[PDB]
């Protein structure tokens, strides 16, 4: 089963529109970077709504994970920020299509001609992660596929089957390899303050892995 790596069938290029959207997002929000977290939490909330809706009609929708939560983890020694939800998750096909492609023109023009509000409205808050990260990694497990990993440094992206297997049960983990100057988002206090402000209106429970020295999930909303 070497055909896949010898052919680079896991490597993809972004759609032109997306490259343009990413720059726009990064160019205008440079003064309001913290916004990225709200957008990831916002996306997490939407995925949780979806599985919840699916659970209404499909009895075995929550089989892979009964809880509906958003958990945030700061890994200082590894320079990573993790935002995990137990929502509907994404299939390999969706990882490629939903994150790699995309009133696109009206927005491309609207953005050019505070955009923190529009970005959310247009459903492209995902890319704001690149304001604070050199690499964004999406690990996701959907009910209809095996766990896969999507990764990108913004110049291309690849998707692979997670060799770790189904560790999520169901859901998605957004992993940010934070830029050297975005180290402050590794600080609990900072994260907690941001999460507490951007979670106040999320209907699902959001936690932050914090210390009191023992560690444990701490409810934020
Ligand atoms: N067009 C902007 C980029 N595309 C997305 O953000 C889409 O990817 C999917 N997505 C993003 N974050 C997600 C997440 N955390 N869980 C499940 N699906 C997610 C949704 O379809 C979302 O609209």
UniProtKB/Swiss-Prot annotation:
Question: Could you state one GO cellular component term attached to this entry?
Answer: sarcoplasmic reticulum lumen
* Binding residues for ATP: 43, 85, 98, 126
Say yes or no: keyword Protein biosynthesis present. Answer: no
Report keywords, A-Z.
Acetylation, ATP-binding, Calcium, Chaperone, Disulfide bond, Endoplasmic reticulum, Glycoprotein, Hydrolase, Hydroxylation, Nucleotide-binding, Phosphoprotein, Sarcoplasmic reticulum, Signal
Which sequence positions carry the modification called Phosphoserine?
105
Which tissues and organs express this gene's product?
Detected in heart muscle (at protein level).
Q: Name one GO biological process term.
A: ERAD pathway
Q: Which residues are glycosylated?
A: 43, 144
Q: Name one GO molecular function term.
A: ATP hydrolysis activity
Subcellular localization(s) per the UniProt record: Endoplasmic reticulum lumen; Sarcoplasmic reticulum lumen; Melanosome
Q: Transmembrane region positions?
A: none
- PTM notes: Phosphorylated by CK2.
Domain-related comment? The SRT pseudosubstrate motif associates with STT3A during translation in normal conditions, preventing glycosylation of facultative sites until HSP90B1 folding is completed.
Q: How does it assemble?
A: Homodimer; disulfide-linked. Component of an EIF2 complex at least composed of CELF1/CUGBP1, CALR, CALR3, EIF2S1, EIF2S2, HSP90B1 and HSPA5. Part of a large chaperone multiprotein complex comprising DNAJB11, HSP90B1, HSPA5, HYOU, PDIA2, PDIA4, PDIA6, PPIB, SDF2L1, UGGT1 and very small amounts of ERP29, but not, or at very low levels, CALR nor CANX. Interacts with AIMP1; regulates its retention in the endoplasmic reticulum. Hyperglycosylated form interacts with OS9; promoting its degradation by the endoplasmic reticulum associated degradation (ERAD). Interacts with CNPY3.
Q: Which family is this protein grouped under?
A: Belongs to the heat shock protein 90 family.
Briefly state the protein's biological role. ATP-dependent chaperone involved in the processing of proteins in the endoplasmic reticulum, regulating their transport. Together with MESD, acts as a modulator of the Wnt pathway by promoting the folding of LRP6, a coreceptor of the canonical Wnt pathway. When associated with CNPY3, required for proper folding of Toll-like receptors. Promotes folding and trafficking of TLR4 to the cell surface.
Query: What is this protein called in UniProt?
Result: Endoplasmin
Q: Which organism is it from?
A: Canis lupus familiaris (Dog)
What residues of the intact protein does this structure contain?
Answer: 69 to 337 of 804
